[PDB]
A paper describes a structure:
The RstB/RstA system is a ubiquitous TCS composed of the membrane-associated histidine kinase RstB and its cognate response regulator RstA. K. pneumoniae RstA (kpRstA) contains an N-terminal receiver domain (RD, residues 1–119) and a C-terminal DNA-binding domain (DBD, residues 131–236), with an overall sequence identity of 79% compared to RstA from E. coli and S. enterica serovar Typhimurium. As a member of the OmpR/PhoB subfamily, phosphorylation of the conserved Asp in the RD is believed to result in dimerization of the domain through a conserved α4–β5–α5 region, accompanied by the binding of the DBD to cognate sequences in the promoter region of RstA-regulated genes. Genomic systematic evolution of ligands by exponential enrichment (SELEX) experiments in E. coli have shown that RstA binds to the consensus sequence TACATNTNGTTACA with tandem TACA recognition sites.
Author numbering:
A (entry chain B), B (entry chain A): 2 to 118
Write the structure that this text describes.
């Protein structure tokens, strides 16, 4: 299964794409908010995994836009521990909001959860 | 909008029923694991909130038993901070697994999510 993962920090970007790899997932990592929407239009993935603090455009705005043009699981994933952000993401159409401090095995388990609708 | 809440602790049982009540959902609280299913069968709720450490029958076995015979959303809410439990219950057909430590406006935000999804 195919996952576009919009993330600046190239270290976590490869580390996560590595882990998700061992467990049978095709991960196209994008490090610009400006470039996603395009990459996401090209790669045509079945789930989309957004960071928040991106360069250029940002995660949450990116989420709001993507909600119109396409109707599949969008999952946020950020260092920003904000109850307000969490509650607003879900209001705008995100399917989950996950702290980066979540154990990878649990991040995998939720991604699998969403790739069932 | 109706929810049965299997939960032994009388204190959390009230706070959740009062809070979710203020927000226009009808919460029925059953304090025994072995008695839920019967309470669920009758009350015919829209979503099921399970504690894990319950008398009679634990929330996790109770969850996989519902899967055969009820197809609404089941949300675990527990004090049990365990990666294995979380990952296991997503795979046994729960829709979410929430630490009781989660702020209540965030709990509401997620329940509202599943009462659409
Ligand atoms: F870059 Be993430 F939002 F931590
Ligand atoms: F009793 Be519960 F599982 F916190
Ligand atoms: Mg960032
Ligand atoms: Mg208990």
């Amino acid at each position: 299964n195919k996952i576009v993962f919009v993330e600046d920090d190239p270290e976590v970007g490869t580390l996560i794409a590595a882990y998700l790899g061992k467990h049978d997932m095709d991960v196209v990592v994008e490090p610009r908010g400006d470039r996603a929407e395009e990459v996401i239009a090209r790669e045509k993935p079945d789930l989309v995994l957004l960071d928040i603090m991106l360069p250029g455009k940002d995660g949450m705005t990116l989420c709001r836009d993507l909600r119109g043009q396409w109707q599949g699981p969008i999952v946020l994933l950020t260092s920003l521990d904000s109850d307000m952000n969490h509650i607003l993401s879900l209001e705008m159409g995100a399917s989950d909001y996950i702290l980066k401090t979540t154990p990878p095995a649990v991040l995998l388990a939720r991604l699998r959860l969403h790739l069932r609708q």
